[PDB]
Amino acid sequence: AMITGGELVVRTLIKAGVEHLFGLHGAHIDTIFQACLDHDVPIIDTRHEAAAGHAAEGYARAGAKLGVALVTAGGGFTNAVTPIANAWLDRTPVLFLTGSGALRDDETNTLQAGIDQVAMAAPITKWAHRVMATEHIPRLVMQAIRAALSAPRGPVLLDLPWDILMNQIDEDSVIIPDLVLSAHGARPDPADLDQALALLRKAERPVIVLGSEASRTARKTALSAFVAATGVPVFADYEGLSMLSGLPDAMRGGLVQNLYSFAKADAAPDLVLMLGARFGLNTGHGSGQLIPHSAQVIQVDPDACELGRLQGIALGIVADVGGTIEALAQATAQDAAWPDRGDWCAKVTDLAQERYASIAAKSSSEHALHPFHASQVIAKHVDAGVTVVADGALTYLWLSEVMSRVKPGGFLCHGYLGSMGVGFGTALGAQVADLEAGRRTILVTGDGSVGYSIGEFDTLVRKQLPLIVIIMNNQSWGATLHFQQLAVGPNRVTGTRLENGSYHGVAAAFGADGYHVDSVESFSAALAQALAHNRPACINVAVALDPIPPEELI
Amino acid sequence: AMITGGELVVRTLIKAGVEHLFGLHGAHIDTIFQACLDHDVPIIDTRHEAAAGHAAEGYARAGAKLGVALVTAGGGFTNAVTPIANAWLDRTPVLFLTGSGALRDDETNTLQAGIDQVAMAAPITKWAHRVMATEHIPRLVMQAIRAALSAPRGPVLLDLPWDILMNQIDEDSVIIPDLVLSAHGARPDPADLDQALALLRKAERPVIVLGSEASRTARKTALSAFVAATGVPVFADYEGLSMLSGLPDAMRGGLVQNLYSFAKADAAPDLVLMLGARFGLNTGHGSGQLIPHSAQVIQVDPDACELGRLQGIALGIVADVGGTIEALAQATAQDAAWPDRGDWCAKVTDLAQERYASIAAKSSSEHALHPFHASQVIAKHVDAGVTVVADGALTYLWLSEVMSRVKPGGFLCHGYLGSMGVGFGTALGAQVADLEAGRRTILVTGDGSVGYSIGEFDTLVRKQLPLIVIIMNNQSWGATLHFQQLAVGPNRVTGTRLENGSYHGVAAAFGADGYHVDSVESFSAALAQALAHNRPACINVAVALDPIPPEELI
Amino acid sequence: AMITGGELVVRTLIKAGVEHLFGLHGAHIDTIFQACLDHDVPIIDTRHEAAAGHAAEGYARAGAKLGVALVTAGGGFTNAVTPIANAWLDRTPVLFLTGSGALRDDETNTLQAGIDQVAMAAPITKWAHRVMATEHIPRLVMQAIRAALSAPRGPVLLDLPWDILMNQIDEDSVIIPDLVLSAHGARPDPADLDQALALLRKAERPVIVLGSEASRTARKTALSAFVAATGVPVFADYEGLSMLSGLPDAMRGGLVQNLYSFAKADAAPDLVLMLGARFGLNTGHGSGQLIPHSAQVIQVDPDACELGRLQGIALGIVADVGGTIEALAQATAQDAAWPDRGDWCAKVTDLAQERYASIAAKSSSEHALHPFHASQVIAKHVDAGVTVVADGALTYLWLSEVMSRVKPGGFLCHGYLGSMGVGFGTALGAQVADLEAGRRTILVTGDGSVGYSIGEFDTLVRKQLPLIVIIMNNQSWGATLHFQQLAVGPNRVTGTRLENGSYHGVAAAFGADGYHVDSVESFSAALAQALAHNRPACINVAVALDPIPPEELI
Numbered sequence A, B, C: 001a002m003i004t005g006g007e008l009v010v011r012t013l014i015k016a017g018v019e020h021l022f023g024l025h026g027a028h029i030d031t032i033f034q035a036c037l038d039h040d041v042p043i044i045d046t047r048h049e050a051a052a053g054h055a056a057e058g059y060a061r062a063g064a065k066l067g068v069a070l071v072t073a074g075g076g077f078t079n080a081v082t083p084i085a086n087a088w089l090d091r092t093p094v095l096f097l098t099g100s101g102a103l104r105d106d107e108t109n110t111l112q113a114g115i116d117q118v119a120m121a122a123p124i125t126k127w128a129h130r131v132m133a134t135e136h137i138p139r140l141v142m143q144a145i146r147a148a149l150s151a152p153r154g155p156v157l158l159d160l161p162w163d164i165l166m167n168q169i170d171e172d173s174v175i176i177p178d179l180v181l182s183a184h185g186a187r188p189d190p191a192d193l194d195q196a197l198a199l200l201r202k203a204e205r206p207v208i209v210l211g212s213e214a215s216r217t218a219r220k221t222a223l224s225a226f227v228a229a230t231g232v233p234v235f236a237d238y239e240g241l242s243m244l245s246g247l248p249d250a251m252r253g254g255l256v257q258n259l260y261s262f263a264k265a266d267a268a269p270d271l272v273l274m275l276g277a278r279f280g281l282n283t284g285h286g287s288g289q290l291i292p293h294s295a296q297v298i299q300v301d302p303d304a305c306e307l308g309r310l311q312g313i314a315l316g317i318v319a320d321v322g323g324t325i326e327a328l329a330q331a332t333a334q335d336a337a338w339p340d341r342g343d344w345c346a347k348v349t350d351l352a353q354e355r356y357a358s359i360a361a362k363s364s365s366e367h368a369l370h371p372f373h374a375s376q377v378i379a380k381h382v383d384a385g386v387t388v389v390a391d392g393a394l395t396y397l398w399l400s401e402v403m404s405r406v407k408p409g410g411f412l413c414h415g416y417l418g419s420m421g422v423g424f425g426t427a428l429g430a431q432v433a434d435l436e437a438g439r440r441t442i443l444v445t446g447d448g449s450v451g452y453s454i455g456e457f458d459t460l461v462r463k464q465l466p467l468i469v470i471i472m473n474n475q476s477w478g479a480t481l482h483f484q485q486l487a488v489g490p491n492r493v494t495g496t497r498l499e500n501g502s503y504h505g506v507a508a509a510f511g512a513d514g515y516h517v518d519s520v521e522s523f524s525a526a527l528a529q530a531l532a533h534n535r536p537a538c539i540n541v542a543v544a545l546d547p548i549p550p551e552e553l554i
């Protein structure tokens, strides 16, 4: 008859279809834990709030759904800050639920109070707000969710004072609302759409770029449709890559980065259809080198700020990426009178291979396992029933080079924040989502990066999560060591060596399987053996340091 | 002639007198690393920016000096937020230098740019500011330090864009300024001072309570003079305990907490003189349970806000605590007509040691090592040559029932943040300060909290810091587990159990000495062997979970 | 028996000795108005919240006490923002009490809610906070007051939700605390003090500069004392000027600006004792031109950030300015063995006159009343029973030139914000304070500036406040017109002419006396006539535009 505010949170979460939370206990948030027990809603409790926040991200990114993080007042919240800022920059819809000091006893110098968590999250969230009344919990939870899920997706921080959670109200007087928000996005205007399609057909060498917004809606069948109908080849930033996974093979350009060569091979596009991809780091800023100044850019983004940010564009449209692709698929179901593009579709596939082979031809494995050969070993196990998470710097740069040539169930790599160490929690949340889909998660990280959340092997074991963590161990903070050397002087290395530590022993000390390997041959067996088992695994791989990936260098 | 913004920063730090930085590398801040090679200033690099921030804190606290943390753009910053908050609430002077995105290329969606780091830190720093031009560096750095070191001490964040730091200027054109800020603090008006002395002279059961501003000023000798002259017992909060270590024992009350039973037995102080003690968690808020409602209170704080925050006071003075301690000492040297107070000193001692005896009497170690028994073992090794850091909750609440009876060099416990896991980095920075004075550092932490920063074992070994890490392993997030059992029910634990992982094992995988123990005698031998060696160690002590410490039982 | 939160505010205000509020009604704050009615506490209700906020400032500045502003939710608060930011920069202690949306009905899109007033005031206040509980009102009001009153003085924003004000509690259960904070400031350390006094005596040509902090404490008798004893001549920024009013005439340097000449007349000080004066605009930044690079600066400020901000200093001391002067007066009551300084004391007075006379010699009144001659007419009525407020730009620049040569009861002019139009509310609040002291307020403003709050003649009449507003009417935004001309081109005037409007008619339409005058002779009669009456007065004075004051020019 009388229920707690924490029970209100959870009943509302359920109504929204939430099935998993990620967090770390504290008394301020106990009422949420008790309610979960009762509705049998697993809370995956980790060893650091960062890893819990990153888990929520990975789960949202892998499952294309809402991720939910739960942390307690004070240090709970401050340890979640890297996750919030990462999700903000990657545009991932996560609800961060955070405990806080009771409203009574404001300004009392009390335990875990006196920290304005809302004010700190405000610069990095789509919405940050503190609940003032137990009665408000459901409408505010549901409002927070709508803000997170709608285009562009992003993090939200709902702060729940201890007071407000512990307070009990008459359960017959309160209304748990529905989540009532169309999953069908908003589409462009038909004029704008025709105009787009007209520019499309009348042009010679066109590409589609995908951004994160395209993976969040996951309008897969509509993507292939529109692609069959038009024969326009498709590139992607990291986050869009798994969207190419169900394409006819011939028209997969893979990673947008390998669009770089196209100046030299004189085949730069005359038209780019940017769908959710933003001007900036992953798209070569406004420099011209990936997206030509001479090309006609058509850009669809839910944020009008993003439209042509760094470079003159020919048409800017505000809409939902998912809703647009759908519109594009429905419009070319009316058409079937589309130009051929044979030269181009092969001219696309051929150049991506030539770059792959140029790395392939370079790269010798004498006296040090080459980072590209490790990357290849990994690529050989990657199909649509595998999510790959990448962390590490050099590690991920090398990895990206083999990644265009495979069709993963997911690909979760660093966004604009570039924060080393987020991989562990990410992959761990990804694997929760993968479990419900039958996929399997592999984390590829550096020896620097892994040390951020290595304690998570513990969580992997307690909750029996089959993640495979592969550590590219080059005994250093590699990209940064490189920078010191190439930028400052061969003699100028400091603070970037990591010549110590047995990570597989750390993993085994936590109760997971740990392999160390230092040859191609022993790596594949370890990998195959790890894939073969339903256990958490660590694979510490010795890897050459001084090879330089393309994306540094020239 | 030509130097980087990096050298500018470093030259100014030198001029101000800093000997050690704490950090972790990034290209954005590399110019600062280089400038530290040349001037041969060590930068203790960690495995997590959080651990680095905390070390600068431990160093500032253990050595009563400025702590300097150095971190990179984006993730480097967000990982520092917790130490910053932590320093904020404990009033500890730490300069946080952070790199950020270049000012040119502002708003370009570029790597590690794109979060407003000043906006995030503003709610938890004394000052937060972004540098606009290389020529501003030395005045801005010097300003940062002044703000960090003045009363009350706290954290400062100085954001340093990549442009500013890479930019080169002719060394001739910019003057490095001096640290002009006399070290003596402001004192009370002689009329206030007299009124306080006046009150102090006519009280039957007077008491002094010290707080953190007393440890940052460290007027040990002035304090002796004044305690010796007036014969008034001294208590302290966690942060002020080492200030009681130069004092005759007949007038050490120990920790404030043990004022509890003075009311609970008809001996409540007449008059309490708070020096930097704030009203709040550590002084029993406004409850009057430690600082009684009936007593007259003279409060001396540098922040008017704190004066009588929760509870009326007789007299509120805003001044530096150290300055005030000096003033008091030297006013007290010259009026030698101070009543005896021998009785009162006795009653105060009897009650402190009654509590202690009483807990001894009821602590049985049959069936598992009792945490009070474990805390006694640590206690038998503590004096002025040892810094004790405390983390973990139940762990520090039991530990703290023994700390009154010993006289440590340092005692670094949780402030208001209450953030589990900050201990490891704190202790690491503390052990750096301690080497300057040949002291030894010991960390006493829970099995939950050590998991936050378990990877600092690697920093211990690569850096040859002989920190001894003691884990009180009760296989749970203990205090939270007790909360579930006591506030909800026996049947109602979830999320609080951690029955997995070999912590000694982890530490060994990183090259540190691991020991496992589970009795008085075995722990006693492990600790003695750990002390005998100059190597980092980890000791994992199986400790009972059931016994409730006095704190809780309120 | 049951009383409102609004009654709690007022009972607390009374206990603090508050006797006047300034504001503008709204229903959200009605409970505060009703309580005022009952305790007979005048609320001076104005025509714009800006003018009410500025009134609170002027009253605090003129009375050396707390000013209290009261404004309602939403636009009430946003119209107070210029006042808050002005008070922040001038360091004036004002409590801004603001209404806001009820806590219930947060996020309801309701009337005057949905505006985070705390977040907007946070960058410009010493403390901004929202009350969460009716029971908290007294301790929070009293805490807000202590933050405002203590060094450095500044604005505070206490936000009071409608809910919280309207809620009624048991009046027998709540404690109205006292304001318990020493009025005696904190003094320097004796070593630091002797050192200062030693540098003082051993130097040849020393000056004292005063800043606003010196007028806020108003330790007058202690100022003269220390000045007799030492014979050191005293300068002041605008805010410190009234502090020179009770000095032996021979040692009054007046406005710090006329220290400018001292390079040329080769008489730059060898020592400057900066007391509350900050490095920056009013003190010639760090350029050397007022305070010599070659001089030994001794600076006392409560803000360690301010100490040597822009220029190398010889000694930096953190303390209360008022408490220091007192310390200086008590230390030289022990001395009476002080060097003569005859050359200098005359070399001081003589150069200030020479600059006065150089303007005097220039300046012809043929076909336009000269701005300096108007300034002189005003100066001739200024003694210690007159507060002068200055607004306007050119107007105040000219005025400042006659101001060194008179002894006002107050002098309130623009601080760093330099906001045109704040004069009207300022002078109006000043006059409330002047009424209780028998003084009389004269506002000297431009024709631009007056138009900001001209509606206030209405308030002047409703509350019968004898202010005299003198409008230097030069039919333009004068300093800005000058800038366009001198900086850009004679032909390049736009947007800076104001060739229209009869201000004395506006005043008369509001029921006040209005003079227009266009000669020296007719101006003095109008002034004398206005002084002679106990009525609000407007005096529109036609004034030449193209004369250029020194402080522009060269």
Ligand SMILES: COP(=O)(O)[C@@](O)(c1ccccc1)c1sc(CCOP(=O)(O)OP(=O)(O)O)c(C)[n+]1Cc1cnc(C)nc1N
Binding pocket: A391, A392, A393, A394, A395, A396, A418, A419, A420, A421, A445, A446, A447, A448, A449, A450, A472, A474, A476, A477, A478, A479, A480, A481, A483, B024, B025, B026, B027, B028, B072, B075, B076, B079, B112
């Ligand atoms: C060019 O900028 P850089 O400063 O070198 C760096 O930020 C970076 C980021 C992306 C790509 C390349 C380098 C990266 S690269 C880097 C070394 C990574 O070491 P790791 O062992 O994980 O992998 P590898 O390079 O050896 O494969 C570091 C420490 N940082 C800076 C950094 C520090 N702390 C945190 C939380 N995040 C960061 N990104």
Ligand SMILES: COP(=O)(O)[C@@](O)(c1ccccc1)c1sc(CCOP(=O)(O)OP(=O)(O)O)c(C)[n+]1Cc1cnc(C)nc1N
Binding pocket: A024, A025, A026, A027, A028, A072, A075, A076, A079, A112, B391, B392, B393, B394, B395, B396, B418, B419, B420, B421, B445, B446, B447, B448, B449, B450, B472, B474, B476, B477, B478, B479, B480, B483
């Ligand atoms: C009353 O609040 P509680 O929730 O019980 C807790 O916040 C606490 C309890 C008593 C004293 C101080 C803190 C503490 S106690 C606590 C258990 C820590 O377990 P650990 O194994 O380290 O030591 P012990 O208690 O077993 O000896 C946790 C997880 N929490 C909440 C919490 C979570 N995450 C972080 C970063 N900091 C925290 N304080």
Ligand SMILES: COP(=O)(O)[C@@](O)(c1ccccc1)c1sc(CCOP(=O)(O)OP(=O)(O)O)c(C)[n+]1Cc1cnc(C)nc1N
Binding pocket: C024, C025, C026, C027, C028, C072, C075, C076, C079, C112
């Ligand atoms: C319920 O709130 P109320 O306090 O009654 C008030 O806020 C209001 C009332 C009804 C509708 C809209 C606003 C309004 S109504 C109101 C009276 C305005 O008087 P006016 O002479 O302009 O028109 P009328 O009501 O006499 O026709 C005031 C002063 N206030 C509060 C207020 C103060 N300062 C500023 C800048 N904006 C405000 N809204």
Ligand SMILES: COP(=O)(O)[C@@](O)(c1ccccc1)c1sc(CCOP(=O)(O)OP(=O)(O)O)c(C)[n+]1Cc1cnc(C)nc1N
Binding pocket: C391, C392, C393, C394, C395, C396, C418, C419, C420, C421, C445, C446, C447, C448, C449, C450, C472, C474, C476, C477, C478, C479, C480, C481, C483
């Ligand atoms: C050098 O900067 P300037 O831009 O000229 C200006 O800010 C200024 C301030 C102080 C001294 C001199 C000029 C001043 S001077 C100025 C003209 C003032 O006209 P007014 O009629 O009051 O007096 P006078 O100069 O004619 O005697 C203006 C509009 N402004 C800019 C301004 C605009 N709006 C507000 C609220 N405050 C301001 N200070």
Ligand SMILES: [Ca+2]
Binding pocket: A446, A447, A448, A472, A473, A474, A475, A476, A477, A478
């Ligand atoms: Ca590495």
Ligand SMILES: [Ca+2]
Binding pocket: B446, B447, B448, B449, B472, B473, B474, B475, B476, B477, B478
């Ligand atoms: Ca534990």
Ligand SMILES: [Ca+2]
Binding pocket: C446, C447, C448, C472, C473, C474, C475, C476, C477, C478
């Ligand atoms: Ca004018």
